[PDB]
Subunit: 214 residues, 2 copies
Amino acid sequence: QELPAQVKGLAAHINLSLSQDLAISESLANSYFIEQWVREGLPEERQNDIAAYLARLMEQLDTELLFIAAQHQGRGYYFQLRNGEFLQRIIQPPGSEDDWYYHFTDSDNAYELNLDSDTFSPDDAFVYVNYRSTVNAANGRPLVVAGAGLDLSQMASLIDDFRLGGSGHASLLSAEGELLVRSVHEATRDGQEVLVSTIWLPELQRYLMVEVDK
Amino acid sequence: QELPAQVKGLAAHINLSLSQDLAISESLANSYFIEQWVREGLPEERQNDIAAYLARLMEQLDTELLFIAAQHQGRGYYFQLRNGEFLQRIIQPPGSEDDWYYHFTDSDNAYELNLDSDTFSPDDAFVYVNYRSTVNAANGRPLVVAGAGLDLSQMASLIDDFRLGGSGHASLLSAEGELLVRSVHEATRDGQEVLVSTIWLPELQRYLMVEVDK
Ligand code: HPA
Ligand code: HPA
């Protein structure tokens, strides 16, 4: 049985690629310079430097979106670097699009990979690598929640990174069954039966299915 | 054959653990805030903030040593955070202990994992994760070479992280044959013959051997 051992290895490669972004999101959320910028009152004069700082990370991670959600004086600020634009806005109450923040910050999870539509551009859905800072604000919420918004097309190129025989389909599913991206048991299907192998990705908290017959 | 597939997976786990430190070393070497501190003339008043910044990384990476080698006005500065001490010195000419720097900076390699004795404490040998910055100084050398110095005892605990049956020995060798750490072919040996499996680690550029008989 070559494929089940093959699937675990290629899943580990996806896991390694995700772990890169996870480590960078962790370091960004707990960056002493970012915390200093937050406690300074988030002065706009330093925004350019912050953007360059995020740009340096964006170039290494090769992710389209980077975000920083910070708490100062009890107010939430959402920053995003994308396509060279540094956007900023105030985090909305839980009744609005920013309820993901209240959800993640109310969870004891250090990180979640939530798929959601961009609050600056509702036309684009990304998978957001929310990582919370170790330091909490005076209101109990994480002082910083920073991470990377991954373009779904990247997820497509990264699962067809390794292809068995150049054909077949690989699929990644949410824990609720929501399909996120598309490139041992016997199943029957339209256009001849196919055999399936699936494994759970811990660092992604998502399931990976891939089918090859012949 | 369970063990050869087992060895590749556990080698990938070692590779994943190393890739964490590699990504952090890359982000640190190309940190815009570090570059700004270097071009500012490396003012001593900001050293405390720099140390806290490195401390935040050291806590996440769980590596004992962090270093920053910077070029300003044609002079090399070596900084190290270890055990809460922020040490600084001037990089010595190629005839002295700092020739590793001239070697790595003369290579076109973005990173090397060189094992060497600490220049601040010659009693302790570490494996240094030298990562060079994308920006170069006016003299042609990398503006920053930053990374983590890993305690060799960590390397020991990370190879016995996963143990087949709780016994056996795992060994990691340099490309020149220098043994770095200790926890498909038939070989004979003192105290009964043993069977060996070896694989090359790309992100570590080192070979991994592990023996189990019965
Ligand atoms: O969950 C999210 N939704 C929208 N924008 C975001 N930025 C980080 N996480 C999110
Ligand atoms: O190669 C090294 N030797 C001594 N100190 C170091 N700090 C980073 N790399 C090294």
